[PDB]
């Protein structure tokens, strides 16, 4: 079998560009990229989890950590796409 973190990446690619191919090297770029970005963000959430002196990591630490790492337009679509997406989910359980 095969495994990567880019099958949903080319899914969203077909959501944006329905007739487009993908190189295998880019699939591993996306996989290593998702893991790298994940460990960085979870790292900063852990660091603030020290800083706030909580034994709990909730969404507050991650969101503010994202606010720490990316400055302006990533922040635009981060609170916009991120927070609005959280708004889209969190009305229910």
């Amino acid at each position: 079998r095969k495994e990567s973190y880019a099958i949903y990446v080319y899914k969203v690619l077909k959501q944006v560009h329905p007739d487009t191919g993908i190189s295998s090297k880019a699939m591993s770029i996306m996989n290593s990229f998702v893991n790298d970005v994940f460990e960085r963000i979870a790292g900063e959430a852990s660091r603030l989890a020290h800083y706030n002196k909580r034994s709990t990591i909730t969404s507050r630490e991650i969101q503010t950590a994202v606010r720490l790492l990316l400055p302006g337009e990533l922040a635009k679509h981060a609170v916009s796409e991120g927070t609005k997406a959280v708004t889209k989910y969190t009305s229910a359980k």
Binding site: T20, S23, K25, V34, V37, S46, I62, P71, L74, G82
Partner: protein, 102 residues
């Protein structure tokens, strides 16, 4: 599943699986996986947009190392978050100075 019920294209279940099995600490982030999935889906969408269109300018539909590195680096703030990274299959950038002209 809840991933669709979150209004997500990315698997909220699998992302939460990265959270619990990632072990970077009673809970994990409440809205945080939705938040990160939204941001990563966004920046993913623009980088796929850049490689697809810019590569499509040469009639080709996949991403070459030139378009790999250029696709990554054409976002300035993503370049800031990835300023100390190495791009495998990247080669170079279009940063040709006039002093870089022979």
């Amino acid at each position: 599943t809840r991933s669709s019920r979150a209004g997500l294209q990315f698997p909220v279940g699998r992302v939460h699986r990265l959270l619990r099995k990632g072990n970077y600490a009673e809970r994990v982030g409440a809205g945080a996986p939705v938040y990160l999935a939204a941001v990563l889906e966004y920046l993913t969408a623009e980088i796929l947009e850049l490689a697809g269109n810019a590569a499509r300018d040469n009639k080709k539909t996949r991403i070459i190392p030139r378009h790999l590195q250029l696709a990554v680096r054409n976002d300035e703030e993503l370049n800031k978050l990835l300023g100390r990274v190495t791009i495998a299959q990247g080669g170079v950038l279009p940063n040709i100075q006039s002093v870089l002209l022979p």
